[PDB]
């Protein structure tokens, strides 16, 4: 997926969506958290040239802190 | 020592005051109860890593201070079940307690024991506690029909 | 194989798993208690036995099928 | 302090001077002020993703 879909517009938002729906506190699916975390870190270090990867993650971090600063 | 680093030192004093002599327990509890954010602080201290005092002593404080009135019992049920955050806690004020770091509805053996003590005990107002528990169950079931 | 699988199923139903959502669960994850360690070791031993005997059963089945099809009996279409 | 309050009369006097409300407010404020130092989820994610002093 890095080689094929990396470096395009909808990428990055895909990473944020999958991270949010996998590591959600409401998620009851049992799976390897930390191994998937290294996989996501590697998929982040590669395709880092994409300008959408960091902005999507920062937008995700922005929404989680929205209860603060009402 | 954990007493100097943490705030568990005061909770040990409260536990001693409440449970040193059973005769004094009622009026201890009556004087202690009306303090704001006390129950939320005790609950947050309970659902934390061991920081000086074992969990069984904290359960005793929470049970005894919550059984002295109906309103306090309902407040304890609400904070244990649906909202563990500090009451009247606006983030703009930098001195009011927040207690933002815990997820609501977390369950441990201590909380289960506390709820069993709250429900099974026989005293005036226990029907209010049972009503609150059933109301929470009904609300959770209704919310579960999100589809 | 059936007996070993049943033993593993019982032993692995005997355990649970904290969800890693609070401080206590994380602390348990840093320092696994002794009972958890011995239970994990026993489960690993049972899994090793199960997988070894499963491989043995699979190779036995492959040999039986090869011999059955070797004598002229047709295999499953 | 615990040894001082070991008698019933001492406990009654302690209540009559507002000690219990004082310790309750003190616990609330101190819990607000300090930050827990014990390890947490962050220190498990880092152990995975890898006297006794070294």
UniProtKB/Swiss-Prot annotation, chain C:
Modification after translation: Ubiquitinated; mediated by RNF41 E3 ligase and leads to proteasomal degradation, impairing inhibition of apoptosis. Deubiquitinated by USP8/UBPY. Autoubiquitinated; mediated by E1 ubiquitin activating enzyme UBA6. Proteolytically cleaved. Acts as substrate for CASP3, CASP6, CASP7, CASP9 and HTRA2.
Q: Give its localization.
A: Golgi apparatus, trans-Golgi network membrane; Endosome; Cytoplasm, Cytoskeleton, Spindle pole; Cytoplasm, Cytoskeleton, Microtubule organizing center, Centrosome
Q: Please list the tissues where expression of this protein has been recorded.
A: Expressed in brain cancer cells.
Q: What does the similarity note say?
A: Belongs to the BIRC6 family.
**Quaternary form?**
Homodimer; antiparallel. Interacts with RNF41. Interacts with DIABLO/SMAC, likely with higher affinity to SMAC dimer than SMAC monomer; this interaction blocks the substrate-binding site and inhibits the caspase inhibition activity of BIRC6. Interacts with KIF23/MKLP1, USP8/UBPY, BIRC5/survivin, MAP2K1/MEK1, RAB8A/RAB8, RAB11A/RAB11, PLK1, EXOC3/SEC6 and EXOC4/SEC8.
Function, as annotated:
Anti-apoptotic protein known as inhibitor of apoptosis (IAP) which can regulate cell death by controlling caspases and by acting as an E3 ubiquitin-protein ligase. Unlike most IAPs, does not contain a RING domain and it is not a RING-type E3 ligase. Instead acts as a dual E2/E3 enzyme that combines ubiquitin conjugating (E2) and ubiquitin ligase (E3) activities in a single polypeptide. Ubiquitination is mediated by a non-canonical E1 ubiquitin activating enzyme UBA6.
- What is recorded about the domains? The BIR domain is essential for its anti-apoptotic function and is important for binding to DIABLO/SMAC and caspases.
Q: Tell me what this protein is called.
A: Dual E2 ubiquitin-conjugating enzyme/E3 ubiquitin-protein ligase BIRC6
The organism named in the record is: Homo sapiens
This protein's encoding gene: BIRC6
Complete-protein stretch covered: 1928 to 2004 of 4857
